[PDB]
């Protein structure tokens, strides 16, 4: 998208979201990142929304195909097609990870931007881990863990316990523990401690911030209800 203005790419990403054209949205936001400037809060959210929709569709398709393939193992077409979708999913994760490494993370000096990008890095390694098989899985899992852990360390030092990015990071890291790392007790402990520390800080918030934080706290509670 090298010939399109940065501001036009951002405007088109917003239009693509309204039109539910998420592949287009991701391509516009990739072009905007590649202009080389840092992203604002709103622009970071557009980048994340675009890719979460693209990879979310791929993950849902991969799960459907994997389920059919496993039942078939109780011609080569189901495996071949699951592999095709898997390769496409891995390519999207690699693209996002490449944008974070060149050069979003290294230029992110404020806590809000750096935590946001490291949470993304953990998420896309987690999506790689969902489809990885073997010892490849081990290094991919450690990459997710390391990204989430660095984000957590910054978030606990630099953000209040009600900050929505801090809360969403803790939510997703708890899902990592439960679903990827086979550490359900660590998942439950993280979700509980996060919820309780946020509850105790709600009194400091405006009505609008209260709504933002409690929405994500309910997600932590929903997981705790499922896990206990």
């Amino acid at each position: 998208m090298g010939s399109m203005e940065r501001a036009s790419l951002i405007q088109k990403a917003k239009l693509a979201e309204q039109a539910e054209r998420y592949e287009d949205m991701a391509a516009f936001m990739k072009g905007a990142v590649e202009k080389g400037e840092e992203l604002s809060c709103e622009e970071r959210n557009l980048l994340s929304v675009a890719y979460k929709n693209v990879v979310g569709g791929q993950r849902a398709a991969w799960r459907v195909l994997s389920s059919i393939e496993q039942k078939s193992n109780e011609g080569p077409e189901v495996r071949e097609y699951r592999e095709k979708v898997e390769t496409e999913l891995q390519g999207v994760c690699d693209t996002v990870l490449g944008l974070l490494d060149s050069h979003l993370i290294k230029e992110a000096g404020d806590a809000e931007s750096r935590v946001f990008y490291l949470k993304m890095k953990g998420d896309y390694y987690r999506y790689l881990a969902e489809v990885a098989t073997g010892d490849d899985k081990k290094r991919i899992i450690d990459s997710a863990r390391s990204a989430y852990q660095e984000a957590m360390d910054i978030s606990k030092k630099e953000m209040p316990p009600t900050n929505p990015i801090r809360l969403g990071l803790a939510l997703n890291f708890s899902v990592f523990h439960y679903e990827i790392a086979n550490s359900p007790e660590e998942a439950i402990s993280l979700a509980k401690t996060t919820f309780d520390e946020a509850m105790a800080d709600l009194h400091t918030l405006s009505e609008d911030s209260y709504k933002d934080s409690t929405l994500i706290m309910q997600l932590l509670r929903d997981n705790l209800t499922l896990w206990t």
């Binding site: 929304v49 979460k52 997703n172 899902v175 439960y178 679903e179 998942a187 997600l219 929903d222 499922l226």
Partner: peptide, 9 residues
């Protein structure tokens, strides 16, 4: 188990 939906700006 649910992560942040993250699919709407």
């Amino acid at each position: 188990a649910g992560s942040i939906p993250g699919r709407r700006s």
